Structure 1
Amino acid sequence: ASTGEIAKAKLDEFLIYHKTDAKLKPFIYRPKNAQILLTKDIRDPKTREPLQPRPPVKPLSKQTLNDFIYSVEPNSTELLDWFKEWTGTSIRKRAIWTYISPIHVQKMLTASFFKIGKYAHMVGLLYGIEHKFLKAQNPSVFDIEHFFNTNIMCALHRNRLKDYKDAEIAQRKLQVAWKKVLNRKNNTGLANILVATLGRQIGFTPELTGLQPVDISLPDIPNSSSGAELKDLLSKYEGIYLIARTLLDIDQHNAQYLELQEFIRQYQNALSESSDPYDTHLKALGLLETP
């Protein structure tokens, strides 16, 4: 019924298809074999009724998981349970282990912190399962523009919301985060700004190997106002809008950089007609803090 409910059904059908046995796939999903399936009377696992034909499964849309992520209730384990079931699949199922994109992990980390309120257990499922992704030939998901930056951004908010000021825990956690990055391709340059802001906030001097200086290269959405092309473009650059607004709000040193404010102007004025992503998230963090 709801967008979340529909997305979950699509995501659960996709997994059931790719977890089905290869010998039995042609007889359970090709509608021309419905009568051959009946005759064989294969018995559904769990000693249930014999298996029945299912509608053929087609490649799933990457937007399907973005809809489910933002439907999870304010305090729920649904996102943490889906990920644990999805990433428990064999690494031989390429369709399952290549569906996850860098955008999905960013949206799983930003939703968990500001909406679902289970960030700690979402950063442990990702840290724990990173080894399987490498074995499954999908290391790109753990990058600097979607995984590292989103993590440091959520840290710059938890360290404030919670007041954490230890200069040893922060550095240790920052080192682990950088060690968890498998696709180190700094492009926007916001990573260096985010790392420097963390050091000022927690009174330490960051020093990570391989994070070479990169000048800001914020993607500028054009003044042209399209429809689904600009709704996708904004949603595409939604993560870096949450990082630009975060950088300025946490520390006023980032106000020095004028590239950050241009993107705010462009991304905000691009669809200022609609609501604000940054503010909408922070409200929920307060609605979750109160509990």
Structure 2
Amino acid sequence: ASTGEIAKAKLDEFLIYHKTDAKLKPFIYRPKNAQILLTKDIRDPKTREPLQPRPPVKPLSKQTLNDFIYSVEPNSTELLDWFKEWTGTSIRKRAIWTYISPIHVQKMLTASFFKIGKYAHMVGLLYGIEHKFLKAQNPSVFDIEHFFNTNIMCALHRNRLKDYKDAEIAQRKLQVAWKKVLNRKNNTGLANILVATLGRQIGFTPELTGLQPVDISLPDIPNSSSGAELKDLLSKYEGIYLIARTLLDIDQHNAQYLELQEFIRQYQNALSESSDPYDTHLKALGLLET
């Protein structure tokens, strides 16, 4: 039905194809071998009728997961069930673990924090499920730009949402987030100022061992209008816009940084027609808070 529903259907088909035995795929997903499948009549689990021929599976686009993220499951744990089923696959299956991308996990964190609201459970799952990703020779899933930055933004808005003046636990959250990263794509430099904003908000000295002290380097977003490319253009730096707005709202001093403001207005122009993701996120958080 909705984009999420079709995305779930395609993802389930992708998973089932990549979870079958290697010697059984040629007899199931290859149409020419339909007669062979009918004749052999393999015994499937749960003592049911032998499998019927199935259409072949082609590589899946990230937009399907993005749609599935953008689908609304405010009080439904479907996101948690899908993550569990996806993370339970064998390490050797490269396709399943190579479909996950930094934008994907960043979107999971964002949707979990605003729309689903139960950010605690999803962040616990994602942070806990890291060793298997590392064994899957896929450490780039966790990066400063997408994973760590989104986590810091969620921490900022969580502190804003619920008052917590216990600085020690906040420092522990920051330290665990810092150690959980693997690829360390610290290029925009927003992480350093985000941690400074967290320190000012709570009152603890920023501390990020090994952090690269790069300044704010946000490339200029063109204000031109295009078709599907424009959609991507905004989404490309949408998170960046979310980070900038959270910094501006939480930190009053953030108005000093003119680069963040320049990025904001550029994005705004490039997005004047459509609704602001930041305001929409706040409205969804407020509506779904109860």
Range class of TM-score, shorter chain: over 0.9
After superposition, give the CA deviation of every residue in 1:196-252 in whole Å (9 maximum; x if it has no partner): 000001110111111121111112211321111110111111111110010000111
* Alignment partner, residue 22 of structure 2: 22
Separation in structure 1 between the aligned mates of residue 113 and residue 80 of structure 2, nearest angstrom: 12
Separation in structure 1 between the aligned mates of residue 99 and residue 34 of structure 2, nearest angstrom: 29
Separation in structure 1 between the aligned mates of residue 29 and residue 160 of structure 2, nearest angstrom: 52
After superposition, give the CA deviation of every residue in 1:70-110 in whole Å (9 maximum; x if it has no partner): 21321111111101100100010000000000000000000
Q: Displacement, 1:288?
A: 2.0
Separation in structure 1 between the aligned mates of residue 36 and residue 132 of structure 2, nearest angstrom: 37
Q: Displacement, 1:128?
A: 1.1
The answer for unaligned runs of 5 or more in structure 1 is none
Note if 1:165 corresponds to 2:165: yes
Q: Displacement, 1:260?
A: 0.4
1:72–1:79 contact (8 Å) kept in structure 2:
no
The answer for unaligned runs of 5 or more in structure 2 is none
Q: Displacement, 1:253?
A: 1.1
2:14–2:60 contact (8 Å) kept in structure 1:
yes
After superposition, give the CA deviation of every residue in 1:47-80 in whole Å (9 maximum; x if it has no partner): 1211111110000001110111121321111111
1:190–1:216 contact (8 Å) kept in structure 2:
yes
Note if 1:250 corresponds to 2:267: no
* Alignment partner, residue 210 of structure 2: 210
Q: Displacement, 1:44?
A: 2.0
Q: Displacement, 1:258?
A: 0.3
After superposition, give the CA deviation of every residue in 1:98-130 in whole Å (9 maximum; x if it has no partner): 000000000000000000011001111111110
Q: Displacement, 1:21?
A: 0.5
* Alignment partner, residue 281 of structure 1: 281
Q: CA RMSD in A?
A: 0.8
Separation in structure 1 between the aligned mates of residue 5 and residue 107 of structure 2, nearest angstrom: 18
Separation in structure 2 between the aligned mates of residue 112 and residue 48 of structure 1, nearest angstrom: 38
3-state SS in 2 of match to 1:220: coil
Separation in structure 2 between the aligned mates of residue 72 and residue 109 of structure 1, nearest angstrom: 14
Q: Displacement, 1:279?
A: 0.5
Q: What count of residue pairs does the alignment treat as equivalent?
A: 290
Separation in structure 2 between the aligned mates of residue 195 and residue 72 of structure 1, nearest angstrom: 30
Q: Displacement, 1:140?
A: 0.4
Separation in structure 2 between the aligned mates of residue 43 and residue 221 of structure 1, nearest angstrom: 57
Separation in structure 1 between the aligned mates of residue 28 and residue 265 of structure 2, nearest angstrom: 53
Separation in structure 2 between the aligned mates of residue 26 and residue 72 of structure 1, nearest angstrom: 37
Greater shift in the superposed pair: 206-215 or 17-26: 206-215
Note if 1:133 corresponds to 2:133: yes
User: Normalized against structure 2, the TM-score is what?
Assistant: 0.98
Identity of counterpart residues, as a percentage? Answer: 100
Separation in structure 1 between the aligned mates of residue 22 and residue 95 of structure 2, nearest angstrom: 14
Separation in structure 2 between the aligned mates of residue 235 and residue 163 of structure 1, nearest angstrom: 31
3-state SS in 2 of match to 1:168: helix
2:223–2:267 contact (8 Å) kept in structure 1:
no
Structure 1 runs of 4+ aligned residues shifted over 2 Å read: none
Separation in structure 2 between the aligned mates of residue 254 and residue 129 of structure 1, nearest angstrom: 34
Q: Displacement, 1:185?
A: 1.9
Q: Displacement, 1:189?
A: 0.8
Separation in structure 2 between the aligned mates of residue 12 and residue 4 of structure 1, nearest angstrom: 12
After superposition, give the CA deviation of every residue in 1:136-166 in whole Å (9 maximum; x if it has no partner): 0110011101111100101101111111111
1:72–1:78 contact (8 Å) kept in structure 2:
no
After superposition, give the CA deviation of every residue in 1:14-49 in whole Å (9 maximum; x if it has no partner): 000000100000010000011100001012212121
Separation in structure 2 between the aligned mates of residue 58 and residue 209 of structure 1, nearest angstrom: 43
User: Normalized against structure 1, the TM-score is what?
Assistant: 0.98
Separation in structure 2 between the aligned mates of residue 198 and residue 173 of structure 1, nearest angstrom: 11
Q: Displacement, 1:271?
A: 2.0
Greater shift in the superposed pair: 206-215 or 90-99: 206-215
Greater shift in the superposed pair: 125-134 or 69-78: 69-78
